[PDB]
Each structure stands twice: as C-alpha cells, then as structure tokens.
What does this fold into?
Amino acid sequence: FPGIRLLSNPLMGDAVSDWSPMHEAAIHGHQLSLRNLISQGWAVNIITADHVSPLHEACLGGHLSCVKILLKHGAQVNGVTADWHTPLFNACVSGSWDCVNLLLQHGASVQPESDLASPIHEAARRGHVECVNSLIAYGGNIDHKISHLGTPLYLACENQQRACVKKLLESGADVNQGKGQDSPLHAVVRTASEELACLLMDFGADTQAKNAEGKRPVELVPPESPLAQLFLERE
It folds into this structure.
C-alpha cells in the first residue's frame, strides 16, 4: 500500500509497533489533535504491525469528526487489519450508523472479500438495526449466507436480538435461511426461545424443514414443553 508502516522488533519489544499518537487521537475522538498531527506532516495512512490504521480506531469509537478528517486527508477506506476488519466492519461494531453512512458515501465496499468480518452480520448480531438499514440501502444482501456462520437473521436469533430479528423479517429477510441445514426456527427452538419461535412462525417459518440430523423443529423440544404444544396445535 501507499502508506507508512510501524514494524515490530521481536528482539526489542519495548520498541513501539502497536500504537502511535495518531491512533491514540483516533481512538479517543480527538479530531483537533489529529488535525495538529496532520499539519505537522504525519501521514493518516499509518498502520501498526497488525495493519490497524487510525481510521479503523476512529470507526470503532464512533468518532465521526475523526473519520471525516482522516478521509479528508486520504485515509484508505477499505483497509483490512490482521483480523480482517475493515473500517466499515468497525463502525458496525460500534453501532455508529453516522460513521457507517459516511464510509458508504466514500465508496466503502458493503461486503468485503473476507467472510471473516462481515459488516451486515456484525451489525445484525449486535442488534444495530440502523447500521443494517444503511448497508441494505447500499446494496448489502440481507440474506448473505456465510459458511459456519449463517445469515444475519440466524445470527440475530442466536444472539437474542429480538428487535433486530423483527426488523430483518419486516425488511424481507428469508425466514427460512439459517446456517447450513439449521434453519432459524431450529436454532431458536433448541434454545427454547419462545418469543423468537413465534416471531419466526408469524413471518412464515417452515415448521416441517429438516436439519442435518433429519429433524423438524418440533423434534428438538421436550414433548411436554409449551413449544411442542404450539407445534402440535398447528399440525
């Protein structure tokens, strides 16, 4: 990339490689401090040994004015850390829809290449509905299914994000797409989440779908449980 790097010295660990005063200012939302460092000739595209830029940190803190000044001075929008995080992913972590919108305005890719850090999944799993909204407005696939993770719907259910599950279903998410053959309905009955089971069913979940073990959702609940009596009622 076109930018300054901070290298680790594995033989000299006190030597700084994991931070700088630019990162320091970004993480704490000190945009005036960032201004001063920039006017002193410090690059905004400066990455730690783990490939973290000040923009990554500003986004993680929801520091909108810091994001703006970094972007103004050429901060890379789509940089990926050693953990595959993009600035957009980090904004989704923080829940700052303002930061998310601004990044998307600056052409941030809605769906980065590493399915190891999906913004829409992260937003959904955290219940950040506004962030989910912004991603969809910029082309994000509400049903994007990742191997060994699932859909945003599946993750929202798994993390008990009832308001988010409701919003995803209201926005047209496929009620029946989960993770592999484990539909969202299977997953929530297994955890005995009656709120989520009824919500999913209200939006047309398939009570007859079979999972990897060949089992319908009803077969994952105790026969005397209130869920079982609901499933039986419908059959």
